[PDB]
Structure 1
Amino acid sequence: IGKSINFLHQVCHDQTPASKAMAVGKSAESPKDAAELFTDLENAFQTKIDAAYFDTSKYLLDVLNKNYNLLEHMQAMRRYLLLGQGDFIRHLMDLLKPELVRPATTLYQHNLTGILETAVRATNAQFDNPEILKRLDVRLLEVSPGDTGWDVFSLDYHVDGPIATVFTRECMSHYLRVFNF
């Protein structure tokens, strides 16, 4: 419950989850324990932490649902590097064959982004308003430019902000391996 309040500080708010009835509660509790004989509560203490738990968990998924589209990006990287839909990637891979066949250059990067943006304006047009299309870029490796050109090319889904919380560093390195096969 203490981890979750820190994840909306990566969304940055000073809001106690959802309602301000959680705020009244802190004020109520401090007299209620103080007035008692010398006894602390503890069979009732675990009861309102349920009512705090369901509140901050559905809301921490709702603060993302307004703003970041987390689980929508869950479907999104899968169709662009887990090859989820073939009409998106054959029409990529067609337009990509005259550049991957030739030796890589020092100017290789500036054409591969451009055909990438016109690639998602030759099968897509309903995802411009979505940020799916503002969150893909071109990934190239350490491979020497004597190469054929194919092997070094891969697309990567660019992650930033509180969406990089769930898109940890260990994950997509393994997708890199799975993209290649």
Structure 2
Amino acid sequence: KRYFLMDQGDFFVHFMDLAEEELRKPVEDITPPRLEALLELALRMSTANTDPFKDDLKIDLMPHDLITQLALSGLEAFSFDYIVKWPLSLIINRKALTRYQMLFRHM
């Protein structure tokens, strides 16, 4: 809820105050360690810092700009992942969290 449903409205002000060097560059220049470092910093400087599962959190990539309905970094391609555990995969699980990431793209 904090990240994907953006209940933290003080998180992404940092992300946009930081990632403008990403949010503009042409295709295939994707750099995920930089994105993970941007997440780690945009976490730390904000109050977003404070929750314990932020480290279970990740930056992932999405190929499609909502055209799944039927870099050019971030705007078409952001994703996050609270990583699965096989004991937990019976409830909170990647295969289902795909639908959840679509809501987050829109928000």
Q: TM-score, normalised by structure 1?
A: 0.47
Per-residue CA deviation, residues 65-115 of structure 1 (Å, 9 max, x unaligned), is xxxxxxxxxxxxx11111112101221232122212212545511210111
Task: Give the CA RMSD over aligned residues.
Answer: 2.2
Aligned amino acid, residue 77 of structure 2: V
- Structure 1 match to 2:101: 176
Change (3 A) 1:94 1:164: farther
CA distance in 2, matches of 1:104, 1:110: 17
CA distance in 2, matches of 1:103, 1:179: 23
Change (3 A) 1:175 1:95: same
Q: TM-score, normalised by structure 2?
A: 0.73
Q: Which runs of 5+ in 2 are unaligned?
A: 65-70
Change (3 A) 1:142 1:84: same
Structure with the greater alpha carbon radius of gyration: 1
Per-residue CA deviation, residues 120-142 of structure 1 (Å, 9 max, x unaligned), is 11014443xx2x12111111134
Q: Does 1:96 align with 2:19?
A: yes
Higher relative CO (Cα under 8 Å, sequence separation at least 6) belongs to: 2
Q: What pairs with 1:20-31 in structure 2 (closer than 5 Å)? A: none
Q: Which runs of 5+ in 1 are unaligned?
A: 1-77
Q: What pairs with 1:22-41 in structure 2 (closer than 5 Å)? A: none
Q: Does 1:148 align with 2:72?
A: yes
Change (3 A) 1:171 1:118: same
Report the 3-state secondary structure (helix = DSSP H, G, I; strand = E; otherwise coil) of the residue aligned with 1:163.
coil
- The match for 1:166 among 91, 96, 107 is 91
CA distance in 1, matches of 2:84, 2:16: 23
